[PDB]
Design a protein around this ligand. Sequence first.
Ligand SMILES: Nc1ncnc2c1ncn2[C@@H]1O[C@H](COP(=O)(O)OP(=O)(O)OP(=O)(O)O)[C@@H](O)[C@H]1O
Ligand SMILES: [Mg+2]
Length: 264
Amino acid sequence: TGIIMENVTAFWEEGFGELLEKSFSHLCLVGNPVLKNINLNIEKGEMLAITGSTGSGKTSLLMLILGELEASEGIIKHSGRVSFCSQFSWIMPGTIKENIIFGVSYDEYRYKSVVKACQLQQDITKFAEQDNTVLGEGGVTLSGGQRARISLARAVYKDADLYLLDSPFGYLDVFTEEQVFESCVCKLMANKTRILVTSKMEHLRKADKILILHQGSSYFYGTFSELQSLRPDFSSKLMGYDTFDQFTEERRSSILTETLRRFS
Ligand SMILES: Nc1ncnc2c1ncn2[C@@H]1O[C@H](COP(=O)(O)OP(=O)(O)OP(=O)(O)O)[C@@H](O)[C@H]1O
Ligand SMILES: [Mg+2]
């Protein structure tokens, strides 16, 4: 399946705020849209890069696809299993391997292929028992990027038609993330429909389609080249840094926010 949204709007409802926490009642009382007039049309096998300002509705858009948020107006269409990799990297008690194949059946070629493309080999090779290493919930003594690669691997190992990847590339080990984006998202998953939330411009550059969000609104939908001509101010400033993508995630996101505020 591909995915289409035709003029979709979703309002704050009781619970969504608490769901997201993993005052809301005021937002629910005043009937405020969390997302307004969203359009997108992604074919089978394409990658959509979602970016925007902080708290612009990026995660909320994913929740709509998952059915955790209701589309009060408009048309959404997709079929098949979805696999969701949350910004929060959860880790269950058990080995690394058990965490990647959690609730699903081990297949040798599939496993090794996902391990390798998620750049996990460089990690497990530092441990005496490699992917048989036992973790506690939270996987608390690992780095953020290590937790995020195990969690991404878990999501990518699942056999689904649509992959939702919420901000996996947000940590300090920025060269590894560059390698993960190439080998996992661009190669291994080249023919899987996929939605990547991100604040790196390279990911926009390589995307089939682009969605920029600001304040629950679609600032821009289309291709990288349309961004460049249809949003010359935004693009000029964002392509203007020499290595924007190696800034911390907080800096990248604060530059996007400020830029979106400027050229609204
Ligand atoms: N942890 C939170 N505390 C208070 N409000 C929140 C929180 N998380 C989400 N919200 C609310 O939900 C709305 C949209 O949030 P959402 O998480 O979908 O945006 P986002 O683009 O994913 O944010 P971020 O840039 O931090 O990842 C915000 O306007 C805010 O009202
Ligand atoms: Mg988010």
